[PDB]
Amino acid sequence: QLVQSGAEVKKPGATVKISCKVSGYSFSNYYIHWVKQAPGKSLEWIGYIDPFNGGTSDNLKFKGAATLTADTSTDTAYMELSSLRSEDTAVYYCARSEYDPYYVMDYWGQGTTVTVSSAS
Amino acid sequence: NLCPFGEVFNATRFASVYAWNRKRISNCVADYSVLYNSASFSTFKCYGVSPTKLNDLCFTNVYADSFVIRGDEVRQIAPGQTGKIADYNYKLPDDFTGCVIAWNSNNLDSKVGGNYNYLYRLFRKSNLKPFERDISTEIYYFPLQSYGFQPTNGVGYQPYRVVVLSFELLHAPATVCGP
Amino acid sequence: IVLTQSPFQSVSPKEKVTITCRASQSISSNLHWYQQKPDQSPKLLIKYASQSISGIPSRFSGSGSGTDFTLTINSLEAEDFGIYFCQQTNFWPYIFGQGTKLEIL
């Protein structure tokens, strides 16, 4: 099971970091996908991190500098999204992944919206 | 100018896991944008740098490598692993900055009955150190056994051509990364 | 690797209702399919487009050839339908088609 942070809202221009903690198996030996879920629209893949190395195969489609880091101490992955902006007020999901090319996202985080407005 | 990534990605043949195509490269400008607009691989896992970032970062030398593995076995290629390919045939250095590409090889490296020309090195007197190459068949028998590449086998036992990059700006000069 | 499977669904329930994953030129044997519920983190239903993972009632089967695949929800009721997304594979940006919402009488 995966656990995200709560729902959040921010300003344009700056950045944000979100997290996801894991339970029930060997974290360090299982990928973690990060997937954006649009506002009232379809899906879009944004990347994934291996827990053990910076296996940050990063879809280009949006280059908002969507950096992935992680930590095997607390068993928590961090998604550092930069250039917060209109196209980003969506629900991001960590996701459990196969360790190599059997990729499937079946176990997820709660899903967290990152709203973008003109102010708080 | 450029320098031809084609001859490793867009080539025809493939080198083995112990005899793998090592290729230092430099004095270039490289359109990684081509690597992106290909959209043909299976995995493009990039360590220590993000694909957009390796574009706009200094590169002195490269260490491109071309070979093949059996599908599942691509899991072995990562810092800190064990297995035939993971240790007894190669090892990903732990001071790394380059990054890895891999994809199926069905209608190039497979056929009915399968292919045999690819040979691993199943044993070794020494698990190949980071990036080293024991192109012999030393005893531990000669351990180089082939892999079957069948359309009906497991997909993790389908053949996957791997091409690795390994960057090195130790103190060597400029002339890479393009723009 | 663009996918355009099925805009949405409108059909009497309990029928063998098909959603047609029309894959682009890229014929990738692998795939996946996930069930989404309103404001609910979806879950993958069809693994590899042919194998069943543990915990799925057999109401919806998955199949297909080469590029073009399909998911036939057999005898679906008013208890199960939501959105159903298709999940591409090996081709590097693992794109997800615009999904299959399921509405029924």
Residue numbers in the entry:
A (entry chain E): 3 to 122
B (entry chain A): 334 to 473, 489 to 527
C (entry chain D): 2 to 106
Paper text:
Cellular entry is achieved by the homotrimeric S mediated virus-receptor engagement through the receptor binding domain (RBD) followed by virus-host membrane fusion. The S1 subunit binds the host cell receptor, while the S2 subunit mediates fusion of the viral membrane with the host cell membrane.
Detailed analysis of the interactions between H014 and S was done using the binding interface structure. H014 recognizes a conformational epitope on one side of the open RBD, only involving protein/protein contacts, distinct from the receptor-binding motif (RBM). Variable domains of the light-chain and heavy-chain contribute ~32% and 68% of the buried surface area, respectively, through hydrophobic and hydrophilic contacts. The 12-residue long CDRH3 inserts into this cavity and the hydrophobic residues (YDPYYVM) enriched CDRH3 contacts the η3 and edge of the five-stranded β-sheet (β2) region of the RBD. Superimposition of the structure of the H014-SARS-CoV-2 trimeric S complex over the ACE2-SARS-CoV-2 RBD complex structure revealed clashes between the ACE2 and H014, arising out of an overlap of the regions belonging to the binding sites located at the apical helix (η4) of the RBD. Thus, the ability of H014 to prevent SARS-CoV-2 from attaching to host cells can be attributed to steric clashes with ACE2. Distinct from other antibodies, H014 binds one full side of the RBD, spanning from the proximal η2 to the distal edge of the RBM and possesses partially overlapping epitopes with SARS-CoV specific antibodies like m392, 80R, F26G19, CR3022 and S309.
